């Protein structure tokens, strides 16, 4: 009706990969390998741990 069971979102690229970090730009909970070794470079990932206000992305250049 309205309520129901729901699991955790898994990275689209890696069907079998427990999400480690969460993306902001696109607003999608993706892994880190996709951010450091993927297309999620220009995006802004944060420490899923807490994910407090303010960006924490310094290491890693941003591509077009
Ligand atoms: Zn992204
Ligand atoms: Zn991934």
Swiss-Prot record:
Write out the annotated subcellular location.
Cytoplasm; Nucleus; Cytoplasm, Myofibril, Sarcomere, M line; Cytoplasm, Myofibril, Sarcomere, Z line
In which residues is Zn(2+) bound? 11, 14, 34, 40
- Per the UniProt record, which residue ranges are transmembrane? none
Q: What's the domain of life for this entry?
A: Eukaryota
| Zinc finger annotations (B box-type) as residue ranges | 8-48
Tissue specificity as recorded in UniProt = Muscle specific. Selectively expressed in heart and skeletal muscle. Also expressed in the iris.
Subunit info here reads:
Homodimer. Homooligomer and heterooligomer. Interacts with SUMO2, titin/TTN and GMEB1. Interacts with TRIM54 and probably with TRIM55 and TNNI3. Forms a ternary complex with RACK1 and PRKCE. Interacts with CKM.
Q: So what does this one do?
A: E3 ubiquitin ligase. Mediates the ubiquitination and subsequent proteasomal degradation of CKM, GMEB1 and HIBADH. Regulates the proteasomal degradation of muscle proteins under amino acid starvation, where muscle protein is catabolized to provide other organs with amino acids. Inhibits de novo skeletal muscle protein synthesis under amino acid starvation. Regulates proteasomal degradation of cardiac troponin I/TNNI3 and probably of other sarcomeric-associated proteins. May play a role in striated muscle atrophy and hypertrophy by regulating an anti-hypertrophic PKC-mediated signaling pathway.
* Domain comment (free text): The RING-type zinc finger mediates interaction with SUMO2 and localization to the nucleus. Also required for the E3 ubiquitin ligase activity. The B box-type zinc finger mediates homodimerization.
Q: What name appears for this protein in its UniProt entry?
A: E3 ubiquitin-protein ligase TRIM63
**Gene source species:** Homo sapiens (Human)
Shown residues in whole-protein numbering:
119 to 169 of 353
């Amino acid at each position: 009706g309205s309520s129901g069971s729901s699991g955790h979102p898994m990275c689209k690229e890696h069907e079998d990969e427990k999400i480690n970090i969460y993306c902001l730009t696109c607003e999608v909970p993706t892994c880190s390998m996709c951010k450091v070794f993927g297309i999620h470079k220009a995006c802004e990932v944060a420490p899923l741990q807490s994910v407090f206000q303010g960006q924490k992305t310094e290491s890693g250049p941003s591509s077009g």
